[PDB]
Design a protein around this ligand. Sequence first.
Ligand SMILES: Nc1ncnc2c1ncn2[C@@H]1O[C@H](CSCC[C@H](N)C(=O)O)[C@@H](O)[C@H]1O
Ligand code: NA
Lengths: 265, 265
Amino acid sequence: MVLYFIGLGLYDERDITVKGLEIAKKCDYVFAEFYTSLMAGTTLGRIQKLIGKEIRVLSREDVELNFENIVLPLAKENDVAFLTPGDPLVATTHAELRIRAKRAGVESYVIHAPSIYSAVGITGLHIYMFGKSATVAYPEGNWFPTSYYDVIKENAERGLHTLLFLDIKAEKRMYMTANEAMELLLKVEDMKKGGVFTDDTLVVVLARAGSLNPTIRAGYVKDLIREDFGDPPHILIVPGKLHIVEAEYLVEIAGAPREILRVNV
Amino acid sequence: MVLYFIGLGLYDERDITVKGLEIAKKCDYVFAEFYTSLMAGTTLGRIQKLIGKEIRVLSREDVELNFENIVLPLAKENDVAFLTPGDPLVATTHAELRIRAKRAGVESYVIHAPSIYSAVGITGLHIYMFGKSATVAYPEGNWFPTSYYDVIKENAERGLHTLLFLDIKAEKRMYMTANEAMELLLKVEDMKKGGVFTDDTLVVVLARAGSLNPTIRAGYVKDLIREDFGDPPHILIVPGKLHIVEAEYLVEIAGAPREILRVNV
Ligand SMILES: Nc1ncnc2c1ncn2[C@@H]1O[C@H](CSCC[C@H](N)C(=O)O)[C@@H](O)[C@H]1O
Ligand code: NA
């Protein structure tokens, strides 16, 4: 009669909360989805071993089209866990799955976990200063999205920071790098010419948030666009005006140039 | 010899990540602060038992004034952990403490935990649609802070949602309820008269996120300002322009007036 949406956290199998792990172990069935995001620092095998029970992975189609035929039927008569990377209901459309559970007469509870939305706090940027967020998607065929560019412009105009999720092809486990995102942004700038993203734009890159050794780098585009930030996932942030404390953190912890203390503050 | 900033999560001792618990268990000294937020589902004793370590609780002044005098010295010759509610770098000024650590020759690491900043996803609102955030501060004496009202105004003009952290005076055990925040805002509305927050404004309240049965409610201020949402902590949200799917969830899960389904376009 109960369905638990459990977050797996940011990077590896230990990023799940103790609450999530203990509940998952008590469930009769454990499902998981790895298409809304990825756990780059672990494998299905390691997660399965930590929990101690076999996990059935579900495709996007399984969930979006048949959640009520695969998961809900079991949740009606048993305790079922639905594992997802990050925080459940964040950076996904899983919220509506709770409505489906309600209509199926199934109770649902949410076990939270760290999300990149909060983890970016490790960049030293004040969380309250972040504005609207966006995703930098890979251009493909006749679709070349550029909406993210307007998001940055509107946030920066108000001195707010912009969190940019970088595209990911979950199935293939292929991640867009900060470098590629910077390349695309420069191309959108070349077309829109709004003076929003250029070689002199200060950006922050967060790679592998969650690991004990994430890469946290800050600097001007012309300098970071060709830098190696290590393995995925990569997150790109375009800061607005900086508080002196944010800037010093960037300099001290993220190797940002001293110039930002007089240019971006 | 290192310093670990470890988040404990939203509600109880099990909201810590497995990564954080195992690391904390192996630290020589463990410090903590419980003034940046309220964990309503556990006790210091229960946390100590989980980690198997005696915890030295520090006051705001201990941290802001003497962190480098109380914690860092020990971190030079021992593995030290500093625990905080939720995520240590969200809606706190602890990030700055990493700068102190570095200049003290102490390497530091961060272990994330579920944060209210992303847990609000349980309200069904699109997390990417949130704009600048603000804190509703308690007035003190004749000093009446109101800058948070302007934050809502700015986001609303952009159609963005506004996350309102509510004040907390730990030492005085003062935890601002959503009701109190609504009262303060209505008073600020009468002063500035900007049509930003009124009896007819739609708001969302999230109480005790992290618990299995948090309070999730949505409705007009006039109707909710007198409602009992249970014990603190509480977080208040003023949605901007709603998407149909957000409205659907608020109605289905947060018991919002079915009339919001008919969104304005
Ligand atoms: N479990 C919870 N439920 C509802 N609101 C919460 C909450 N935890 C924190 N808050 C909100 O956030 C305020 C603390 S601000 C510090 C937040 C913390 N670092 C985090 O990551 O969550 C509280 O006064 C309250 O308004
Ligand atoms: Na945000």
